[PDB]
Amino acid sequence: GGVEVLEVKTGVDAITEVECFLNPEMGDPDENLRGFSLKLSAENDFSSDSPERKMLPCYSTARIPLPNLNLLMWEAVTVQTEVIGITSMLNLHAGSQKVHEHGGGKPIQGSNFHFFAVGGEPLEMQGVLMNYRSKYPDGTITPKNPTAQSQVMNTDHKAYLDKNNAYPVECWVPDPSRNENARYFGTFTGGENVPPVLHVTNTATTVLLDEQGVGPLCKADSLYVSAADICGLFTNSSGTQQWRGLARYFKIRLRKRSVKN
Amino acid sequence: EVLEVKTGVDAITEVECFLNPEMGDPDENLRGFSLKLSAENDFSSDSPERKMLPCYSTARIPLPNLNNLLMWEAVTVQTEVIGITSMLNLHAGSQKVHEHGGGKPIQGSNFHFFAVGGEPLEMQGVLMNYRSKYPDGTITPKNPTAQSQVMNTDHKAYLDKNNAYPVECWVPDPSRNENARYFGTFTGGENVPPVLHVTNTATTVLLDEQGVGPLCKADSLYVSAADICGLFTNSSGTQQWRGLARYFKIRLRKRSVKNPY
Amino acid sequence: VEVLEVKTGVDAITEVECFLNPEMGDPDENLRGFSLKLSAENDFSSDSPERKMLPCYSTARIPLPNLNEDLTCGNLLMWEAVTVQTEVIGITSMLNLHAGSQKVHEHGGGKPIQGSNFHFFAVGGEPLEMQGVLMNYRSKYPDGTITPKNPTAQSQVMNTDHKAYLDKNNAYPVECWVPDPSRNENARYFGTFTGGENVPPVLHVTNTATTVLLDEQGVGPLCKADSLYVSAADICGLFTNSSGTQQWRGLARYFKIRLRKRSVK
Amino acid sequence: VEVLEVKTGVDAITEVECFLNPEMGDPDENLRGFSLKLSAENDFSSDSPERKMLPCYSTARIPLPNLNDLTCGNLLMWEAVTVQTEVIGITSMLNLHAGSQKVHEHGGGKPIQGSNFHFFAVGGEPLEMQGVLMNYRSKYPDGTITPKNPTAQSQVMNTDHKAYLDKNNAYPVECWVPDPSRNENARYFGTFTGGENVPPVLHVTNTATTVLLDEQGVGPLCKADSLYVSAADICGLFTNSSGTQQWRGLARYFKIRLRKRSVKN
Amino acid sequence: VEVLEVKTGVDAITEVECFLNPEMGDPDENLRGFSLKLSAENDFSSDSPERKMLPCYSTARIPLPNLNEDLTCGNLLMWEAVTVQTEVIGITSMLNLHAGSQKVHEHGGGKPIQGSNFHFFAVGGEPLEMQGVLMNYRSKYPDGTITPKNPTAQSQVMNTDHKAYLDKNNAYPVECWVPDPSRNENARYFGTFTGGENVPPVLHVTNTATTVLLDEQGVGPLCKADSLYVSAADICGLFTNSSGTQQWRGLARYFKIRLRKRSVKN
Ligand SMILES: [Ca+2]
Ligand SMILES: [Ca+2]
Ligand SMILES: [Ca+2]
Ligand SMILES: [Ca+2]
Ligand SMILES: [Ca+2]
Ligand SMILES: [Ca+2]
Ligand SMILES: [Ca+2]
Ligand SMILES: [Ca+2]
Ligand SMILES: [Ca+2]
Ligand SMILES: [Ca+2]
Ligand SMILES: [Ca+2]
Ligand SMILES: [Ca+2]
Ligand SMILES: [Ca+2]
Ligand code: NA
Ligand code: NA
């Protein structure tokens, strides 16, 4: 969302600044519950595990188009990123189960995953499943023809994050054996009672240069941003639980680089 | 366009202030607390009272008139949350932890935030529930939609008024604030312990990557804060936010600039 | 004070070593280091805590080797505090789970001390400057304590009337006062508050750790009238008796402070 | 091995990439990456865990481009300089719909949580291990390699229990640790976090590198042109809807950068 | 000391390696590394813990190459400890949840070791200097222990009468004594106490970590009488038996210390 691209060229020197956000793809079970999943089911036998599409958070991604240009290529040098709306979880009056008789609502808590990537091509993913026998729904892209080895490392499960709201977060991780032309960062914190801990500051910049001083190079003059920001579980007054996600901001600086094809 | 730092005898000034917390102040005696929290309101019928909603605090601090032109440049800040030991009173009002025990400490979700800028803090609105009906005397996202639960770029505001912008509705906007520095941490959960450090030896440098601090437009500095420490649980089981004031000491220097006009 | 140069070498350096005992309330002669059992659920309009229930800040004034014996030589010296090594004394005493504490379950050991804690020290050349802040401005504080006077609802946030020196040991309740960040130009203070029923005490000891007390201009606290001021509060958590009653437990703090002679105008 | 100069030539650098699958017990063909359900409350005199209940260390020998023989010219060995490593599949624990006990009526499944151990090593020879037992009287199964001649002293430090991690899916994690008295030619890193309610906390990034050079600037030297990687990544316990519990493990990726080093022998 | 290796190379350097066993109480011959089960709720006026219930500090004197035939010199050569590498041994043993421990719930695995823990080591040129502090000054400590003498209520805070040397292994209860920050001029010590009934043990191992033992003047512990002292306490937490009874569990600690010869003022 909100993609803005600015190229400034003075002679030899060309800079592009990209600003955008990615909305989260938590499942959106109805139009009013944008940012949430469908309520979670539980205790499905591994042999009869058929999760509904709207229950499954997916990775977010966007292809950002750059000024269409040894080759000259756009090189991503820095990123500033932030999770947007962390204070929204201070609403304990709407929908959440009371913590006790006469108390306020229960904060969002529980397992969470915060992840982003910036690359010159789609993020390369490796599939790993909790249960290889899970039957995934139409509209998801999940590991093809999985086996019990898919519960550990099965090198058959290679994919590109090339479609928004399609690759379930539970099925896929960034592939550390690939991604030579992207930088990715994620933290998984698991557990029923895990507190969300989120920091915001406009003073943080991540440098995307590798050990040789080279950033992601934008093949075919396109930049890819990717995210997943599952903040935890929202517990309804009935006890049902729904994932809650938040959008992620990106500001990326790129420069024009002459490079070996 | 920034030129050189002025290096006279009177080229430095120090500003000190504190910001009181704006938790809701539900009666004349409960300054620093919110109204007791409601719970389990349907998203379609969520009408929080004003005194239940903590707000961001801010102050415009007028600076010596200087005047192509000189502007005050904020270089460092020392800041501290004031009165953290008041939470060691476990005899007053709080529910016993168990039969024969002391009162329950303040605990639960918290948010600690401050900013220093040369202009008002720029905010982005994000809601837990876009259908919340916010009370008279609050400034909340205007004409929100389900997209306001994720990122809706319509929701831009300046923190220009005290006791107005609820913390649950607004975050510092990472797409703006070019002339401010902000820092916040949200920690969510029923059982989160407050962890607060005080020392007069800690300094935050406000200079950006180019060595430039916030520049005080119109010879005014803006400080902003929110310090929701957690929930106070009354002996009845009702819960109220507790906030604390924030101290600021800002060092500024005179900076020559080309009038940007 | 206009600060000039550090004085040279040999006897230009002194070390002060001391400890501060904790002031937790000491409800009987056998329970030194503990508070009285905590009360709970007092209405804000009828909150009258007993003295022995209220931990207080510890403080001492340490007299330093006399400088400026030669009053009219026109070269004025003050001791400058440069470094401190400090730690909490007796942290392993909390491994006694056989005495007094409630069993964790049938046949189990005693419950460890845990819960809200506050660890704080300061080193200054004058008394520590405090700001009063109350949970409940209507609290009626007992004889023997020094607490914010004539408080109002504003005293629950920031009321600038409540300024005091930490000028008496075992008198200023920790729950009423904090170091004032708007003052203390001639002291350094450090504190961490961790609140909650189930917080674990986490305490580190090492004789290899040093805190430098010099400010941004390289100047440490300057000891007015050849006096060094140490202050502490080390509330370790709550001790839960077999009945379920709870008492604060505190421990002493050690200080080793290195000072040098500083010329001043 | 006496090290001489780093070689700087054209083919002086190589990269090895691999992953190690976890060895959690694999109690049936469908439950790769899990252990058998845990037994509990076995007397120390009658503790005989089944093989499928015991997570084991993973290890592999990685062959390197052949160098070299003192009679066949100059001596060269690969030196491991850096490693990039991470745990693969951490997001799979976001499946709370399959198998796991509901957290409460109408709730989602219980996340994997509880005791965990994350460990890796890179060496020029097999990892050297020291045996330590919870209970020296534990009878370990066919197919495992456990401390030989265990005694009560094996519950603390029995220097008899020395082994090389030279076999995958054989050395139970609960019986063995890396030996800090050996491993002169390897680097190892591990963290154990124990408890019923411990949250898994796992970071991934392709920007993180661990330098394997020692204080003299020397990395693991790959004897016989082989590198050894070792891992254990027990992520926590999976709680079935019945209340039974199973360990869950995940694979570990390694990318190791090596350079050619001249050596005397 | 379970095992000791002392190597003095051609280059006037000594490397000392040892493993120091924990002293948790050892209530029977099969429960090495554990304490006796804990008692609870003893009145402060009737608190008489049994010896086997009380973990004690571990210590050993390590003999070094005897340097000075001519002890009657104004300058002496002494061993100077420069670095230490240390590790807690056997942390993965706590992954045994099948033996002895109470089930977490019906059909579950055993309860992990958890609760209060203390991890401590020291390297010195002489015995570790200790300060006594008691939870309860009226505790009656058993035969075979060395505990603060003639304690008073001040012994529950700081009573400077309680000075001791850690001069006996398996004798000084951890609950009674701490390293004395007012002494130990010729030793370095490091400890972390984490208290609480549900605390998770968190233990890291790596052979890449080294602690430098030099003071601010670049001088390490100087080994008086050609002896080095290592000291430890590694209480990992409580083991909960299926009955509900609890026992401390401890682990051994490895030391690798590098020393050099220093000419010093007699
Ligand atoms: Ca599909
Ligand atoms: Ca690769
Ligand atoms: Ca591209
Ligand atoms: Ca601060
Ligand atoms: Ca302004
Ligand atoms: Ca009396
Ligand atoms: Ca008495
Ligand atoms: Ca030959
Ligand atoms: Ca060795
Ligand atoms: Ca050895
Ligand atoms: Ca080899
Ligand atoms: Ca001393
Ligand atoms: Ca000695
Ligand atoms: Na008192
Ligand atoms: Na196996």
CATH number of B2-257: 2.60.175.10
- Cβ-count burial D212-221 (b if 16+ within 10 Å, e if not): beeeeebbbb
CB contacts, 8 Å: D216 with chain E: none
Coil vs helix vs strand at D154: helix
SS3 sequence, E115-172? CCEEEEEEEECCCCEEEECCCCCCCCCCCCCCCCCCCCHHHHCCCCCCEEECCCCCCC
Query: Is there a contact between E114 and D181 if contact means CB atoms under 8 Å apart?
Result: no
The CA distance from C142 to B132, in Å, is: 47
Cα of C67 from ligand 13 centre, angstroms: 40
The CA distance from E167 to E180, in Å, is: 14
CB D2 within 8 A of CB D263: yes
Q: How far is CA D96 from CA A49, A67, A233, A240, E103, in A?
A: 11, 43, 11, 13, 23
The CA distance from A245 to A34, in Å, is: 9
- Cβ-count burial B68-100 (b if 16+ within 10 Å, e if not): eebbbbbbbbbbbbbbbbbbbbbbbbbbbbeeb
The CATH fold assigned to E3-265 is Polyomavirus Vp1; Chain A (2.60.175)
The C-alpha of E69 sits at a distance from chain C's nearest C-alpha, in angstroms, of 34
CB E90 within 8 A of CB E123: no
Query: Is there a contact between A107 and B236 if contact means CB atoms under 8 Å apart?
Result: no
Beta bridge partners of E199: none
Fill in the DSSP letter of residue C5.
E
The C-alpha of B46 sits at a distance from chain A's nearest C-alpha, in angstroms, of 6
Q: How far is CA C152 from CA A251, B51, C162, C175, in A?
A: 48, 20, 11, 16
Ligand nearest to the CA of C52: 14
Cα of C88 from ligand 14 centre, angstroms: 19
The residue whose two tokens read 């890819």 is A224
Q: How far is CA C1 from CA C221, D206, E245, E257, in A?
A: 11, 55, 64, 49
CB contacts, 8 Å: E40 with chain C: 97-98, 101-104, 108-110, 242
Contact partners for chain D, using 3 or more CB pairs closer than 8 A, are A, E
Question: Quick one: which of B55, B50, B24, B238 has its CA closest to B132?
Answer: B50
Question: Quick one: which of E228, E44, E219 has its CA closest to E121?
Answer: E228
Backbone angles phi, psi at A207, to 5 degrees: -85, 130
CB contacts, 8 Å: D97 with chain A: 40-42, 44, 49, 51, 55
CB contacts, 8 Å: A193 with chain B: 189-191
Suggest the residue from B31, B76, B90, B162 to mutate for an interface test with chain C (most C CBs closer than 10 A): B90
The CA distance from E71 to E51, in Å, is: 42
Backbone angles phi, psi at D134, to 5 degrees: -65, -45
The CA distance from A117 to A127, in Å, is: 17
Backbone angles phi, psi at B2, to 5 degrees: -95, 130
CB D161 within 8 A of CB D132: yes
Backbone angles phi, psi at A189, to 5 degrees: -125, 115
CB C33 within 8 A of CB C91: no
Chains A and B touch (3+ CB pairs under 8 A): yes
Query: Is there a contact between E92 and D189 if contact means CB atoms under 8 Å apart?
Result: no
Fill in the DSSP letter of residue A109.
B
Beta bridge partners of D263: D3
What is the per-residue DSSP string for E177-211? EEE-TTS-TTEEEEEEEE--TTPPPEEEEETT--E
CB A203 within 8 A of CB B207: no
Question: Quick one: which of D48, D22, D7 has its CA closest to D146?
Answer: D48
Which of D39, D115, D187 lies nearest to residue E95, judging by beta carbons?
Answer: D115
**Tokens, residue C55:** 């931990």
Chains B and E touch (3+ CB pairs under 8 A): no
Which of D37, D177, D181 lies nearest to residue E90, judging by beta carbons?
Answer: D177
Which of C99, C207, C208 lies nearest to residue E135, judging by beta carbons?
Answer: C99
Question: Has domain D3-263 been given CATH number 2.60.175.10?
Answer: yes
Query: Is there a contact between C109 and E40 if contact means CB atoms under 8 Å apart?
Result: yes
Cα of D127 from ligand 10 centre, angstroms: 13
Q: CA angle at residue C121 from C115 to C127, to 5 degrees?
A: 130
Ion ligand 10 — residues with CB under 5 Å? D 181
Question: Count of CB contacts below 8 A, A vs B?
Answer: 198
Backbone angles phi, psi at B51, to 5 degrees: -70, -10
The CA distance from D17 to D46, in Å, is: 43
Backbone angles phi, psi at B177, to 5 degrees: 50, 45
Find, in chain A, the residue whose alpha carbon is nearest to that of D96: A42
Coil vs helix vs strand at B52: helix
Question: Quick one: which of B255, B257, B254 has its CA closest to B11?
Answer: B254
Find, in chain D, the residue whose alpha carbon is nearest to that of A52: D97
Query: Is there a contact between B238 and A103 if contact means CB atoms under 8 Å apart?
Result: yes
CB B109 within 8 A of CB A109: no
The CA distance from E193 to E177, in Å, is: 13
Query: Is there a contact between D108 and A185 if contact means CB atoms under 8 Å apart?
Result: no
Which of E40, E135, E188 lies nearest to residue C94, judging by beta carbons?
Answer: E135
Query: Is there a contact between E95 and D117 if contact means CB atoms under 8 Å apart?
Result: yes
The CA distance from A129 to A229, in Å, is: 19
CATH class, range A4-259: mainly beta
Query: Is there a contact between D157 and E95 if contact means CB atoms under 8 Å apart?
Result: no
Torsion sign, CA atoms B137, B143, B145, B149:
negative
- The count of other CB atoms within 10 Å of the CB of residue C64 is 18
Chains B and D touch (3+ CB pairs under 8 A): no
Ligand nearest to the CA of D80: 11
Backbone angles phi, psi at C164, to 5 degrees: -155, 155
The CA distance from B75 to B255, in Å, is: 11
Cα of E27 from ligand 14 centre, angstroms: 42
- The count of other CB atoms within 10 Å of the CB of residue B67 is 8
Query: Is there a contact between E193 and C202 if contact means CB atoms under 8 Å apart?
Result: yes
Suggest the residue from B34, B46, B151 to mutate for an interface test with chain A (most A CBs closer than 10 A): B151
CB contacts, 8 Å: D199 with chain A: 189-191, 194
Beta bridge partners of C264: C3, C76
CB D63 within 8 A of CB D226: yes
Find, in chain A, the residue whose alpha carbon is nearest to that of B111: A87
Query: Is there a contact between D174 and E252 if contact means CB atoms under 8 Å apart?
Result: no
Q: What is the resolution of this structure in A?
A: 1.4
Method: X-ray
What is the per-residue DSSP string for A49-108? ----GGG--B-EEEEEE-----EEEEEEEEEEEEEE-GGGGG--SBSBPBSSTT--BPPP
CB contacts, 8 Å: E204 with chain D: 189-191
Find, in chain B, the residue whose alpha carbon is nearest to that of A29: B146
Question: Has domain C3-264 been given CATH number 2.60.175.10?
Answer: yes
Cα of E98 from ligand 1 centre, angstroms: 41
Question: Quick one: which of B146, B226, B168 has its CA closest to B48?
Answer: B168
Ligand nearest to the CA of E230: 13
The CA distance from A133 to A137, in Å, is: 13
Cα of A149 from ligand 2 centre, angstroms: 21
CB contacts, 8 Å: A239 with chain B: none
CB A139 within 8 A of CB A58: no
The CA distance from D102 to A240, in Å, is: 10
Backbone angles phi, psi at C261, to 5 degrees: -80, 130
SS3 sequence, B174-212? CCCCCCEEEEEEEECCCCCCCEEEEECCCCEECCCCCCC
The CA distance from B27 to B261, in Å, is: 47
Amino acid at A243: W
Ligand nearest to the CA of E15: 9
The C-alpha of D91 sits at a distance from chain A's nearest C-alpha, in angstroms, of 5
> What Rg, from alpha-carbon coordinates, does chain B have?
20
Backbone angles phi, psi at D153, to 5 degrees: -65, -20
